[PDB]
Amino acid sequence: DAVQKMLGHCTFEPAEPKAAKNTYTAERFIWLTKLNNLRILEQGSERPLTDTERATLMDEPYRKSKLTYAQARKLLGLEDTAFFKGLRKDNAEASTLMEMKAYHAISRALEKEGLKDKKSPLNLSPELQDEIGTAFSLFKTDEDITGRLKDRIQPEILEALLKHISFDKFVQISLKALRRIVPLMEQGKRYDEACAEIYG
């Protein structure tokens, strides 16, 4: 769940590249973790978000640019009585719970070059997104980036990405290890239990 600008190998499945931060899977893993361990401080009672609650916040980080705790409060219908665990400040519910920066960066780039529409689905294969990030994190020259792309993506949409997007940082778990972990967490399971379930 943590970040680092230097490259490594997965702790669980060695010989695999640590996934870049700005990949749909990694970005989902980060969002899945935060929603899965988020807790409601109601009176003197701590509570986990229920299934429907999480569902009303599941796809929202993709839809809007950021998800502030304030947005989640209105979305959940939380009374002022309830509060958010972990959150520290004058206006802290304005802090971004999740952003999914890669998703909104790729989308903004395509819609910037006029090859995509606003408020529209980012019509991209997830593995596509991933490698777009993986490439823009491991290469910086237009030459090396394009060569890795290997026409996996249309020439028009690659000019767009090579014109406005820039990525860094990794996530300590391989994209492959995530691929077996990220379905399990969509079923409500936490990283703590899911990692041991698959690998441990």
């Binding site: 490259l7 490594g8 823009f136 910086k140 090396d144 406005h164 820039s166 860094d168």
Partner: protein, 88 residues
């Protein structure tokens, strides 16, 4: 060893970085600094594409400038460390 934009990341790993703890502090820490500085410079190489005040052509100029200076830093770290003994 020769460092390139393609060799980069494949050589600027935390594993090679760990192999530098072997050196004395007055030999380790400086090479570590160059190592870190190259990592930070490459990572932010295409940051200019995100900025709009610059022109796309003028942004590509910094890119080439950043990547070259970054692989320059990593190469010095690698070479300075190899002379101190640690192999990669």
């Amino acid at each position: 060893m020769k460092i390139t934009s393609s060799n980069f990341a494949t050589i600027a790993t935390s594993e090679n970085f760990a192999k530098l703890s072997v050196l004395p502090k007055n030999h380790r820490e400086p090479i570590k600094g160059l190592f870190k500085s190259a990592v930070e410079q490459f990572s932010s190489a295409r940051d200019f594409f995100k900025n709009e005040n610059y022109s796309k052509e003028l942004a590509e100029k910094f890119n080439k400038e950043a990547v070259n200076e970054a692989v320059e830093k990593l190469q010095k770290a690698i070479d300075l460390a190899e002379k101190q003994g640690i192999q990669f």
